[PDB]
Structures are given as C-alpha cells and as structure tokens.
Design a protein around this nucleic acid. Structure first.
Length: 167
DNA sequence: GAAGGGCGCCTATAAAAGGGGGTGGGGGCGCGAATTTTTTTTTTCGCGATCGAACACTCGAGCCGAGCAGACGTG
C-alpha cells in the first residue's frame, strides 16, 4: 500500500485516465492497471492507494511511483508517502508425489486438510507465521509473508518433512 | 435432438482499505397476537353465606276544619 496524502476526484480520474475503470454502484475505489511489471492499483477517495501484482518489492515501489506520476500528470498534488509492503506470495515444486494423510496425522495441531472442499492441504506455520498450500503433485504455495527470508525460512523448515513423505 | 466433450468459472488463502449491511444487545410501546375454548362437569350438593329488590310502618311538615278573636251592621 501507499498513501498519496491528499483527497482526489475519482470520477475525473476515470474520465482522464486511459487504463482505468470506475463504478460507484460496484465499488468505491478506482481501478488502474499498467503494463510496467504488469500490475493493478486501488485508489481511494481518502487518499490511500493499494498496489498489487508486482513480482518484486523494487518494481512495486517502482509501479507505485509511476501511479503517483500519472496522478501528478492529471494536475493533482500527488505525494509518495507511507509506502509499505503488506504481503508477499511465493511458490515452488519438489517434483515428487507426497503423503498427505500422514502429514495431517503427524501435524494435527497445524494442518487442516479438507480433501472434500479445497484439494490441497492448508498448513499454518507459526515461525514467520506463514500460510502454506501443499498439493499432492508436490507443488507448494506460500502467503502471509512480509519479507522473502520468511518464505525461504518457512520452506527450509518444511522441505525435509515433505521429502520424508515422498512416494 | 439427446448424449458427450470442451471451455471456463468456482472455492481457498492473504491482506489492506472504505463503506454498506446483518445480528444482537437493550430498550420500549402496543394491541392486537387474539387462544377463544365450550367446556369439563362433578352434582350429589347443602348449608350459609352475601345481596338487592320488594314493601310496610312511623314521623315531620303543611293544609283544612273547628274554635276563637277582630271587624261590620242593626236594634
């Protein structure tokens, strides 16, 4: 997220902008999307904006600055204030099938495998407090992170266990 | 045209931000919400209660008759 520091007129924005859309009857924020690092932003009337989609923190800082740029170019007193990363998402694969019934058995306290509902196992780490999604093919997705190290650490913890249930 | 293959959305997690929306916590006014029910019968009482209509005798105040006082007319 980032705060622009001033109030704006989203309808004018919607009118001016070329890569945006606005619908008060649907949602309050105006939606913008740029090809740079290919991203999307949520701009509030309050002066707050949210930026998602970047594949690195520098490019997200880059994209947000680019958004602040087009807002300036509209004639508005944009300010790059209070920039902060709120979440990071990662994934990887291990290339082998795995034992999930066992994993949920041996980690009952954390796991919440629901094969009926969502196909993969939901694992809630409490180290760098991270949420993982593990699938039978071996693919793994991670979220809840604030820095890359938490992903490597959370994965560094889970990888031996997973190899240990290899089929 | 029915049976089937293909395409694409669905649910899940996260996370924040703005505002509209749902439950309950608490409060309070209403007047219907009427549930109107035929009951369920159990009288067999059975007296002794209470209770208001029904009615008769006595007293008090006013009027009329007799007694008495005042006024009018004749001897």
């Amino acid at each position: 997220t980032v705060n622009l520091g001033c109030k704006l007129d989203l309808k004018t924005i919607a009118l001016r902008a070329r890569n945006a859309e606005y619908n008060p009857k649907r949602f309050a924020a105006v939606i913008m999307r740029i090809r740079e690092p290919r991203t999307t932003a949520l701009i509030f009337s309050s002066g707050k904006m949210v930026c998602t989609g970047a594949k690195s923190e520098e490019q997200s800082r880059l994209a947000a600055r680019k958004y602040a740029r087009v807002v300036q170019k509209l004639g508005f007193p944009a300010k790059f204030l209070d920039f902060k990363i709120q979440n990071m998402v990662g994934s990887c694969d291990v290339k082998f099938p795995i034992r999930l019934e066992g994993l949920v058995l041996t980690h009952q306290q954390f796991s919440s495998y629901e094969p009926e509902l969502f196909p993969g196992l939901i694992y809630r780490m409490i180290k760098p407090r991270i949420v993982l999604l593990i699938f039978v093919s071996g693919k793994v997705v991670l979220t809840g992170a604030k820095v890359r190290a938490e992903i490597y650490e959370a994965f560094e913890n889970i990888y031996p266990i997973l190899k240990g249930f290899r089929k």
